[PDB]
Write a protein that binds this ligand. Sequence first.
Ligand SMILES: CCCc1nc2ccccn2c1Nc1ccc(C(=O)NO)cc1
Ligand SMILES: [K+]
Ligand SMILES: [K+]
Ligand SMILES: [Zn+2]
Length: 357
Amino acid sequence: PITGLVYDQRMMLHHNMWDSHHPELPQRISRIFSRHEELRLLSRCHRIPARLATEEELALCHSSKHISIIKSSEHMKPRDLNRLGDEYNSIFISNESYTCALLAAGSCFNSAQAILTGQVRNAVAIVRPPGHHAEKDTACGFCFFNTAALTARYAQSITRESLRVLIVDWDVHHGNGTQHIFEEDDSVLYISLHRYEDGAFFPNSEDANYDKVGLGKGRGYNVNIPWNGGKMGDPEYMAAFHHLVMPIAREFAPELVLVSAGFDAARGDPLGGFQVTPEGYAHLTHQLMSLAAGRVLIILEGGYNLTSISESMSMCTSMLLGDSPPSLDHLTPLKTSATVSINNVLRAHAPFWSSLR
Ligand SMILES: CCCc1nc2ccccn2c1Nc1ccc(C(=O)NO)cc1
Ligand SMILES: [K+]
Ligand SMILES: [K+]
Ligand SMILES: [Zn+2]
């Protein structure tokens, strides 16, 4: 019945020394946090302590080599930090980056613990750097370790291996790392909504397409919902949740819901180019809350407008706290390309999910 909230100031020590205005600013987690205090949402939450993820915990998803490299970044000269940053796609490294990644992963571990024990009902994690682009062996797109995947694996490790975990990635970018991490796995259902534009959008790969339904034992447990044809807003995400996310999720019957809650699909984002309003995010959160008896963890990922992300994640926290959902627009209809996308996903996943047939 109570909502946990984890946040640590120390996660701002990760920064870009060569570009001070690089959009993945440290203030992102602070600004959001301040909103939670000034809308008096923080007063109504149970503060969960941050902590450092152990290297054995990072081993749940990442190889020892990758861990050892990013760990070696801790004590490096700035020239070496640039040298190692250039070895990855869209990655800047600081001396403090490894610690901040450990803080994000550990914070989400403590949140998942407080949920799975019974301390809290649901929880929200205001963390950085993000994680869903990180893969088992490499760092990508502002991410070092996959916080969501590691939180699923840890949640299984403190309960049972077969624990059904639902990861819903509504960041505007595809979570390639989470997909590849759980591609052959049926215990973790991964569903992503992402701007695709037929590979023209980052991470610029055809792996984000609707036909990637998983591999072998994990076939059908990987739902890609790719958007094409310009800006999308509340109508399209609401329709994708109505016809795909919630039916498949209800058939899957998850026991823990992790939300890769990137807010770069929001209004006013310079990188996503979408117009999902904070009230729409509130409605998606409210819909996800009806699953897994309410056990939902909202992990911050992307989102590069301070006001947009503060308002949006504050709305999600309001829904987690039990407030009633604000009324939403009139939708009108959907961009035809979005209906075509939903129909493509439905055709791809109908053989695996009876509730789609
Ligand atoms: C904006 C700074 C760097 C940049 N500029 C472009 C232009 C086109 C395509 C990619 N670009 C990237 N790289 C990104 C990697 C990850 C993310 C992400 O994960 N957001 O949540 C966003 C951008
Ligand atoms: K996504
Ligand atoms: K999967
Ligand atoms: Zn993103």
